[PDB]
Amino acid sequence: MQIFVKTLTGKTITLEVEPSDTIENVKAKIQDKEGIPPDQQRLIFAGKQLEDGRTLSDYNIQKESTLHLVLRLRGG
């Protein structure tokens, strides 16, 4: 479903992600839309981050929810 994606500075993305999909599949869809690699991405729900092996159905993530993106710049 349409889940909005917030960033730190304010990019908003319309993702069509089913709740059956895993969290790594959510990362791989931001590959094809903005070029961002998944190995830099963080994803936060109200204090709790997302593990890689889980899905979006564990946290009761309903329709029209918000993500958060924090970029892990490997080297600075």
């Binding site: 730190l8 500075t9 981050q49 593990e51 924090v70 892990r72 080297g75 600075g76």
Partner: protein, 146 residues
Amino acid sequence: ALKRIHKELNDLARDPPAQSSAGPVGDDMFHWQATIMGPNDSPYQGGVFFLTIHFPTDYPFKPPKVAFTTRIYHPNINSNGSICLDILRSQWSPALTISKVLLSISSLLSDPNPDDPLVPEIARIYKTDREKYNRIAREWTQKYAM
């Protein structure tokens, strides 16, 4: 650098961010203090860590100085307290608020960036071992923070 700070306090009192809090020390609207509640996926359970936030008086067009007052063993964090982020150092924008900075600090405690450390001898055993710092981060945070 005076009127936008009044509305950040509206942005922190109406909806305070998770595992976070902030506010001024006193009459000075350029020296702030903040706390961090430790996350549960991290080896930082039983969190509280204090902060100091200094405004360069051309805010929001110069990155603020945020340092640690409590000692934290973590590869991208000095023994003096300065945080090694690419946000507050190089890649910064005037559209970032402190409430977005605190969520970028809270996410350092779960997973760091082990490719550019500050004390480089700490980040060596992260790259080879995993069972050591799971205990070290639980010993040195129950003493100097709890």
